[PDB]
Write a protein that binds this DNA or RNA. Structure first.
Ligand SMILES: [Mg+2]
Ligand SMILES: [Mg+2]
Ligand SMILES: [Mg+2]
Ligand SMILES: [Zn+2]
Ligand SMILES: [Zn+2]
Ligand SMILES: [Zn+2]
Lengths: 279, 94, 185, 261, 224
RNA sequence: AAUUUUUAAGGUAUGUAUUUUUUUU
RNA sequence: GUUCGCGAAGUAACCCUUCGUGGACAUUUGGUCAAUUUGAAACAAUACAGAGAUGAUCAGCAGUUCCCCUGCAUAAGGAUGAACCGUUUUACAAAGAGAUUUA
RNA sequence: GGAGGUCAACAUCAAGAACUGUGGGCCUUUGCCUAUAGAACUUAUAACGAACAUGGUUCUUGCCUUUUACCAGAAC
């Protein structure tokens, strides 16, 4: 079932150069052009899912070889114990979610405790097969990653059939903060100045007023006074007001980032290089 | 006058009833068996001749529900109702 | 709410002779063959058996704008093709009724919403050698006529038709607008 | 009747025989989802159909008749139907008695129960439009006949007149020598569609003449819907045949009003 | 109304699933959308499958499944239940089998991982695995006499299904036992459930002392 | 008196055309 | 087919078999879907054009559009993701000057 | 009619140590006082589970080119 599901999604997306082998290793078969490369970038839903099937396939394969007669009972129990402890080393699920290192370390610890109670008085050898603790640990990890994979895979497929949303309103974050600050300032100035003037003509005039604003801000940074020849006083009042607002925000951020840098907290990189210009 | 008590108790109810219809329908639309826990013959054919009974068949839970649903853009024509009346030196200074 | 609310438009003709009918309501079925937008699909069956399921092709709006039937795409009054019912309304009066309709994609997707309406809806080896033939009549007419009275080639550029019966004896029979004559070797 | 009525159509092809899916090696790897050969360049997918029907011989009574399902088996039209007497659709060439029952719905969907699309298709492909009633068929790729060339249009015309003849009515047929395109108009809509599927990707000549044994190999012939006839000769006639039909359709429409009162 | 669900022949499922192996036909267009649509639920099917694993004293478990008629997915619909003391006895008893068999044989080989090569498609049950008789499980000798109470029903899949007195019923909840049986189970489980039995021993080790040590940022000598 | 292990992305563009059987004067 | 009852047959301490019958028990599946070329996946390869500002080489972040792609995504990437930097003549008169010009 | 069902639906399951019903009395039925009937399941080294996972937001941290994936404590 699983193998057919993942092949149909892959081939659906149009990737026939990526090959799933029957142990759920996703291998490229060929050298890829960048477009091939960008389309075959492939998310954590697919990979995490695939790794999860790989764990399953592994255990079911052990019981198969028990049933085929190739192995033994004791060797079966030791086998699945070895699987449930070494999922780190056999699978690689940790790459796609790294939080799982908690379950992996727990299985390692349960290993130690079970061995040195088990192997007391006899041997270093591989004989083992008390798999109940590790099995529980993995079952619980499963208990909580069902809603992850259902939300992820739900999104991946509902996008795959129905396409992504057109709107996509993007939040304000660290990178695109001060661009938004600009935009709100420019709008905020056009509002006032357009509400002052008598009526008839705006748009070229609208464009020109903003150039006076930015010029005036540049003058504020350089400490140059920014007088202008004949300009209506009220407009000058407006521009000075908003430039004092922007100057206050600019200075306050200059100080805040500076104490943040002093005490040692992580200020990134260009916030330092940007800061020192402000200061 | 103020709206009055008996009228405000009316529109409060009829709106509150209406909104729940939107919230319920909207929760039960999207993909969640989890979030959906918060939630008529209808036709006399034309002249009424045949009559009708309508029953909505249950879809297969694997297949995409709303098979016709796909995200697409639409440019909307302008609404029917029309014509709301608007009813409303310095050039050298400004 | 505008999506589900309008009731479906289905003819009395195709809807069958049955006294009471069950039909299937799918909130989102196929798009129109016209506007290419989703709508609510309605199956039904004329009889509790038949072999054939009936399916609403176009929208309620796209049908209403054309004053036609969803299942039939025939006029909701007279059960006429739209390619025709306009021509009847063009003959009457003088020049009208032509529907310039729905090209590109976002055109028709935009066009279906407006209530302006459209067109007509708003108002609501023996070779005989054959000559003297009107270009217009089809071969199907000729042979049918011969059959009624009692195998064939025609050339329509020529206006000449040849006829081989399965026996001159037929020749005598039929010999019991045309240029006939009987010859072959 | 003597041909169709009594018989239940013999199975055209055994289940085992029918071509397999997965057309062979157009591309480096098969795509399970879209069934195609993905990566590489196709070199004209098209081939001559290995199958064709025998209009008189294969036609017979079937289970669709007892059901009386309106729609026709298309795998019969290709002569490829493997169900035969157990098929649920009608096996035969359309007549005016069966057309009359379809005549309600033939506008929205073809004779096979395939819904028509509004705008046609670029190259005038499989099914037409439910906007226009088109009785005119276009033939192309006469290379389906293969290299063997015929002395005049007489050989062509008569052959085309012979082959399409069995598939229903014919209003007229015109081959063109300058352009290898022959326009066929059946009397009826439903017949034009039945011929399209039956005659596509096919070969020509006699059963055993010349290169017939190696006939299977070639490019195959197109059968497509046809554009309006541009010459004012038929353009008058198409419009004149239009009006005269329109006048017939006023009377019946005032008759059921004459009935209505 | 509500008639319960109809159990079926496994043959039906088998035919479904191995039919859908090869699909290139057009008839599969709506059975492929079911495969993709089913991918959302797969991590749950892995759960139910993997919590019902056999346990060593079982040679095989036969578990209910719930399958999609298009063969898109197959859920294991049981949940396991166990009598706690009976279960502890079984695991403890195998435990002793493991030590005896570890000390027993000199060379202990371990399975190669993965067991099957990448390119070999997963072998079918009905052909390969079904015909062979199963190898014996771990069990334990268990004694001729002492264990006479438990020895009959100990290693059964669900140890007591049909006993009116010993257990609720086929639904298999609410166990009830007699004294000497419990004597036998407590006797068997000594390698595992052996532990201290005074509240007094635990002393600083009980939760509340750990919650304190966390709150005060101290540590008991052996505490976390 | 005891740490802890890794995968993607920001680098090698992107765009257009290309395998087609000759729509009636 | 089961069961109840009745009516007949051969055997019959009335019962077993056999036939003909009245009634009860049980009551409308499935399809939005037909099996390759003609109702529409894409990629690669080939040829052509080449990846912002500017004197030149570079980090980027936004905005606008009936552009989207990878991604679980309201993160982040995709040449700063792409496309955009073109075209622009009338709410229009007031004063005066010259000339033609008619009751 | 009983014994059952790895059957289903519906109701309920963290609160002044904590539930309802009823009769009477004051209020004029909410509420207060008084008499009385019945309280399955879950709780005191606190709880449906002698078991134990994941996510979100906001704080304080740890790795530190940025996002994902992450370190580990808290509140909700
Ligand atoms: Mg960046
Ligand atoms: Mg950009
Ligand atoms: Mg970007
Ligand atoms: Zn529509
Ligand atoms: Zn109709
Ligand atoms: Zn057939």
């Amino acid at each position: 079932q699983g193998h057919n599901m993942l092949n149909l999604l892959i081939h659906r997306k149009g990737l026939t150069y990526l090959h799933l082998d029957y142990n759920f290793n996703l291998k490229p078969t060929k050298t890829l052009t960048t477009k091939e490369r960008k389309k075959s970038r492939l998310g954590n839903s697919f990979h995490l899912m695939r790794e999860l099937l790989k764990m399953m396939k592994l255990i079911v394969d052990t019981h198969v070889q028990f049933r085929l007669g190739n192995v033994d009972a004791f060797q079966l129990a030791d086998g699945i114990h070895y699987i449930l402890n070494h999922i780190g080393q056999l699978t690689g699920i940790y790459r796609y979610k790294y939080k799982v290192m908690h379950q992996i370390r727990a299985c390692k610890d349960l290993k130690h405790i079970i061995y040195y109670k088990f192997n007391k008085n006899l041997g270093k050898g591989p004989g083992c097969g008390f798999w109940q603790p590790a099995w529980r640990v993995w079952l619980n990890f499963l208990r909580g990653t069902i809603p992850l994979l259902e939300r992820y895979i739900g999104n991946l497929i509902t996008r795959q059939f129905e396409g992504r949303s057109n709107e996509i309103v993007k939040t304000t974050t660290k990178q695109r903060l001060d661009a938004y600050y600009d935009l709100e300032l420019r709008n905020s100035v056009m509002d006032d100045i357009l509400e002052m003037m008598p009526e008839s003509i705006r748009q070229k005039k609208a464009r020109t007023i903003l150039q006076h604003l930015s010029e005036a801000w540049r003058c504020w940074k350089a400490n140059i006074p920014w007088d202008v020849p004949g300009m209506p006083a009220p407009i000058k009042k407006i521009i000075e007001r908003y430039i004092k607002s922007k100057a206050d925000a600019w200075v306050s951020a200059a100080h805040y980032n500076r104490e943040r840098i002093k005490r040692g907290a992580h200020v990134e990189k260009t916030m330092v290089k940007k800061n020192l210009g402000r200061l | 006058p103020l709206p009055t008590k008996a009228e405000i108790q009316e529109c409060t109810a009829r709106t509150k009833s209406y909104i729940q219809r939107l919230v319920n329908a909207k929760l039960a639309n999207s993909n969640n068996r989890a979030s959906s826990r918060y939630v008529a013959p209808a036709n006399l054919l034309l002249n009424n001749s045949h009559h009708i009974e309508v029953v909505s068949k249950q879809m297969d839970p694997l297949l995409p529900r709303f098979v016709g649903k796909k995200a697409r853009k639409v440019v909307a024509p302008t609404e029917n109702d029309e014509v709301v009346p608007v009813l409303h030196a310095d050039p050298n200074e400004w | 709410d505008e999506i589900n609310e309008p009731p479906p438009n289905i003819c009395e003709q195709c809807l069958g002779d049955e006294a009471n009918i069950r039909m299937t309501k799918i909130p989102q079925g196929s798009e129109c063959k016209i506007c290419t937008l989703p709508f609510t699909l309605y199956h039904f069956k004329t009889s509790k058996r038949s072999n054939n399921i009936i399916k609403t092709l176009i929208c309620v709006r796209c049908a209403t704008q054309r004053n036609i039937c969803q299942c039939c795409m025939l006029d909701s009054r007279w059960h006429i093709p739209i390619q025709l019912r306009d021509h009847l309304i063009s003959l009457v009066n003088e020049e009208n009724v032509m529907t310039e309709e729905a090209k590109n994609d976002m055109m028709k997707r935009f066009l279906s919403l407006k209530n302006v309406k459209l067109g007509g809806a708003q108002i609501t080896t023996k070779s005989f050698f054959l000559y003297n033939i009107d270009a217009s009549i089809p071969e199907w007419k000729i042979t049918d006529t011969v059959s009624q009275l009692l195998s064939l080639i025609v050339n329509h550029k020529a206006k000449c038709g040849g006829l081989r019966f399965q026996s001159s004896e037929l020749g005598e029979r039929f010999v019991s607008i045309f240029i006939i004559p009987w010859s072959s070797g | 009747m003597t041909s169709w009525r009594d018989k239940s159509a013999k199975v055209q092809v055994k289940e085992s025989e029918l071509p397999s899916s997965i057309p062979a090696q157009t591309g480096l790897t098969f795509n399970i989802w879209y069934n195609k050969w993905s990566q590489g360049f196709a070199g004209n997918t098209r081939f001559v159909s290995p199958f064709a029907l025998q209009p008189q011989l294969h036609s017979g009574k079937t289970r669709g008749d007892n059901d009386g399902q309106l729609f026709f088996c298309l795998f019969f039209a290709k002569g490829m139907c493997c169900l035969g007497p157990k098929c649920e659709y009608l096996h035969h060439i359309p007549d005016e008695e069966d057309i009359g029952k379809l005549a309600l719905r033939t506008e929205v969907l073809d004779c096979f129960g395939r819904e028509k699309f509004a705008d046609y298709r670029e190259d005038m492909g499989g099914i037409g439009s439910f906007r226009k009633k088109n009785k005119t068929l276009y033939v192309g790729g006469i290379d389906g006949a293969l290299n063997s060339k015929h002395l005049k249009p007489a050989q062509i015309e008569s052959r085309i007149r012979f082959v399409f003849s069995r598939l229903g009515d014919i209003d007229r047929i015109r081959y063109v020598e300058s352009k290898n395109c022959g326009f066929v108009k059946f009397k009826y809509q439903a017949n034009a569609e039945f011929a399209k599927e039956a005659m596509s990707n096919q070969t020509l000549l006699l059963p055993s003449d010349k290169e017939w044994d190696d006939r299977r190999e070639g490019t195959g012939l197109l059968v497509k819907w046809a554009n309006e006839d541009p010459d004012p000769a038929a353009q008058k006639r198409l419009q004149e045949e239009l009006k005269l039909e329109s006048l017939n359709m006023m009377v019946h429409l005032i008759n059921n009003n004459t009935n209505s009162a | 109304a509500y008639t319960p669900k109809a159990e079926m022949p496994p043959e039906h499922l088998r035919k479904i699933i191995n039919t859908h192996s090869d699909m290139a036909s057009k008839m599969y267009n709506t059975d492929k959308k079911a495969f993709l649509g089913a991918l959302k639920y797969l991590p749950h099917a892995i759960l139910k499958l993997l919590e019902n694993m056999p346990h060593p004293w079982e040679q095989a478990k036969e578990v209910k499944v719930l399958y999609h008629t298009s063969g898109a997915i197959t859920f294991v619909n049981e949940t396991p239940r166990v009598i706690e003391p009976v279960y502890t006895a079984q695991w403890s008893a195998t435990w002793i089998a493991m030590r005896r068999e570890k000390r027993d044989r000199t060379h202990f080989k371990r399975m190669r991982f993965p067991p099957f090569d990448d390119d070999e498609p997963p072998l079918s049950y009905e052909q390969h695995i079904e015909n062979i008789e199963p190898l014996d499980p771990i069990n334990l000798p268990l004694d001729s006499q002492d264990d006479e109470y438990v020895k009959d029903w100990l290693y059964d899949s669900r140890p007591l299904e049909e006993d009116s007195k010993k257990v609720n019923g086929t639904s298999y909840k609410k166990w009830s036992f007699d004294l000497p049986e419990m004597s036998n189970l407590y006797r068997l489980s000594t390698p595992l459930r052996d532990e201290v039995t005074d509240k007094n021993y635990y002393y600083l080790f009980d939760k509340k002392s750990f919650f304190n040590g966390k709150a005060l940022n101290n540590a008991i000598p052996g505490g976390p």
